[PDB]
From Swiss-Prot:
Residues 204-217 are annotated as: 2-5A binding (P-loop) 1. ANK repeats lie at residues 4-33, 38-67, 71-100, 104-133, 142-172, 176-209, 213-243, 247-276, 278-302. Endoribonuclease that functions in the interferon (IFN) antiviral response. In INF treated and virus infected cells, RNASEL probably mediates its antiviral effects through a combination of direct cleavage of single-stranded viral RNAs, inhibition of protein synthesis through the degradation of rRNA, induction of apoptosis, and induction of other antiviral genes. RNASEL mediated apoptosis is the result of a JNK-dependent stress-response pathway leading to cytochrome c release from mitochondria and caspase-dependent apoptosis. This is 2-5A-dependent ribonuclease. The nine ankyrin repeats also called 2-5A sensor constitute the N-terminus 2-5A binding domain. The protein kinase domain is predicted to be catalytically inactive. It allows the homodimerization. Residues 228-250 are annotated as: 2-5A binding (P-loop) 2.
């Protein structure tokens, strides 16, 4: 009955129907209603759609400015996702703390990085957001940072702003031991990965970090089948061409097994032919005789 009206209020907000929102609130609908599934409120929804006027309407009807939903997100944090500087500023005047976080450790600054909201990022920075915070949950899915988020998501401009203008530590690691370089290679679209990797390497990113399963940047690039990345990575002075993953396989072995001749040949022109195992055998069983030629030219065995 009244529970129906409360959902109508949220629906009215979602539909951006101001008159209806007013009528329902003046009707006695619970302004702080939380839908049971996600804990969302009319205010959360209003913020998500960047409707400042609807937000102010809800606030004037007594909406709790800092009421969190199930994941712990506040309207303030949602404002960062929406990329709204005005709303971010608004909730800071309402008691929000610039460094507060949802139950997964996500702060506003991180959300801005995740969603590539440049203006929100810059505003939150000047408000004294801790740029280098590592996420505190309440798994080995934590310890991440805004820089890793930007790298993973491919937001090149944000990544630069963090590295150049905001003192982001390029070599911080999450709980899994992964750094921004790893995150960029793990998920970033092939569209932005080269530029992001280039930027990180220039800023002193450690090429010899171990990710999940002992995977290194070099190995991840090989598994990406991306020749450009492998080439860029090998240009690093202190790169370990012979590092092995948990399975004890090197970048070259994987290149051969993955049937990548050009990448494998690149690795040979600098790497180690025996450290990885029976390469010629693998290349031959795959009918790649051209690769067998290269491997033998570099001292492969049988």
């Amino acid at each position: 009955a009244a529970v129906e009206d409360n959902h109508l209020l949220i629906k009215a907000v979602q539909n951006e129907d101001v008159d209806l929102v007013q009528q329902l609130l003046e009707g006695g609908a619970n302004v702080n209603f939380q839908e049971e599934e996600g804990g969302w409120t009319p205010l959360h929804n209003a913020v998500q759609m960047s409707r400042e006027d609807i937000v102010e309407l809800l606030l004037r009807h007594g909406a709790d400015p800092v009421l969190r939903k199930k994941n712990g997100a506040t309207p303030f944090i949602l404002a960062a996702i929406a990329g709204s500087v005005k709303l971010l500023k608004l909730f800071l005047s309402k008691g929000a703390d610039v460094n507060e976080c949802d139950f997964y450790g996500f702060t506003a600054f991180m959300e801005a990085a995740v969603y590539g909201k440049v203006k929100a990022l810059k505003f939150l920075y000047k408000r004294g957001a801790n740029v280098n915070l590592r996420r505190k949950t309440k798994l080995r899915k934590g310890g991440a940072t805004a820089l890793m988020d930007a790298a993973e998501k491919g937001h090149v401009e944000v990544l630069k702003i963090l590295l150049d203008e905001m003192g982001a530590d390029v070599n911080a690691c999450d709980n899994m031991g992964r750094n921004a370089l790893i995150h960029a290679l793990l998920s970033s679209d092939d569209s932005d990965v080269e530029a992001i990797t280039h930027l990180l390497l220039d800023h002193g990113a450690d090429v010899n970090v171990r990710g999940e399963r002992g995977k290194t940047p070099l190995i991840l690039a090989v598994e990406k089948k991306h020749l450009g990345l492998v080439q860029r990575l090998l240009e690093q002075e202190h790169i370990e061409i012979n590092d092995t993953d948990s399975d004890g396989k090197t970048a070259l072995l994987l290149a051969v097994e993955l049937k990548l001749k050009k990448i494998a040949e690149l690795l040979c022109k600098r790497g180690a032919s025996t450290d990885c195992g029976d390469l010629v055998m693998t290349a031959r069983r795959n009918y790649d005789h051209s690769l067998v030629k290269v491997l033998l030219s570099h001292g492969a065995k049988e």
